[PDB]
């Protein structure tokens, strides 16, 4: 920028998207990465491997294509994340993938977070992943209980129209249940 001697960061460092110091440590395992990413409305989970010209995604799951299996609720929550993890995990298994390491990019290792939910799902799908059980949520919160009780303090639907008024952690079960047998793209 300023002169010949100026040092310009690697592109993905300028874009503040990739932490290369963490990337390296991640690639050390030699295992596929379980890329856990979030969006204001959605949650994505990808199983990425290393390649000659860039990463190769062997399997992935987006919270949006969750409705494709009967999801009728918001997609930016805990139950959403878990299921996306499980969906991606299953597709992963189908692809011959057996193990992976949790890459949470620039997100924080907060206990009970969604990235960990994604991790819990991927593990349940059958994926062997280095983890720590007490940094994960307590199942109920994964089910979406924290939100149902939150709607108990109603007076006004937590969901603008959407589905239900008192919400449904049950809808969560029905879906998980579904994913655990047969069905297309799995």
């Amino acid at each position: 920028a300023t002169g010949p001697r100026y040092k310009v960061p690697m592109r993905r460092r300028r874009e503040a998207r990739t932490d290369y110091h963490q990337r390296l440590r991640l690639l050390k395992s030699g295992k596929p990465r379980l890329v856990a990413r979030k969006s204001n409305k959605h949650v994505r989970a990808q199983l990425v491997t290393l390649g000659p010209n860039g990463d190769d995604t062997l399997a992935s799951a987006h919270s949006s294509d969750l409705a494709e299996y009967g999801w009728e609720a918001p997609t930016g929550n805990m139950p959403s994340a878990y299921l996306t993890g499980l969906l991606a995990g299953l597709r992963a298994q189908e692809a011959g993938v057996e193990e992976a390491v949790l890459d949470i990019g620039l997100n924080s290792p907060t206990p009970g977070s969604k990235v960990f939910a994604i991790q819990e799902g991927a593990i349940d799908a059958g994926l062997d992943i280095p983890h720590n059980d007490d940094v994960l949520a307590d199942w109920q919160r994964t089910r979406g209980a924290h939100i149902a009780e939150y709607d108990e303090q109603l007076e006004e639907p937590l969901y603008s129209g959407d589905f239900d008024a008192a919400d449904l952690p049950e809808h969560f079960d029905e879906l998980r249940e579904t994913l655990l047998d047969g069905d297309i793209e799995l």
Binding site: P4, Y6, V8, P9, Y20, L24, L27, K28, L50
Partner: protein, 95 residues
């Protein structure tokens, strides 16, 4: 030389051009090589670990197994056979 340490006279070979300055890309630090492969030896000024004695910068040896994550590369110093312990960060496939 006025001294005889490993870094004697290594001011040029172990210094980066201002633009290549800073942490190196991890892609080449994880590269995998197979026994028999020819690799060029060259220390990456930015990468502290997995180095070899600077005298060998510029050698092209033959990977022959590994130790830990580092590779064991066979070279010939002058007329003498030597085995160098080096990490991918400092190696490149020949050709």
């Amino acid at each position: 030389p006025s001294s005889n340490g490993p870094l004697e006279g290594t001011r040029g070979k172990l210094k980066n051009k201002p633009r290549d300055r800073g942490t190196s890309p991890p892609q080449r630090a994880v590269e995998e090589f197979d026994d028999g492969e020819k690799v060029h030896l060259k220390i990456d000024p930015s990468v502290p670990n997995g180095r070899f004695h600077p005298r060998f910068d510029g050698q092209t040896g033959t990977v022959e197994g590994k130790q830990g994550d580092a590779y064991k590369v066979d070279i010939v110093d002058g007329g003498k056979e030597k085995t160098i312990i080096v990490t991918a960060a400092h190696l490149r496939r020949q050709e």
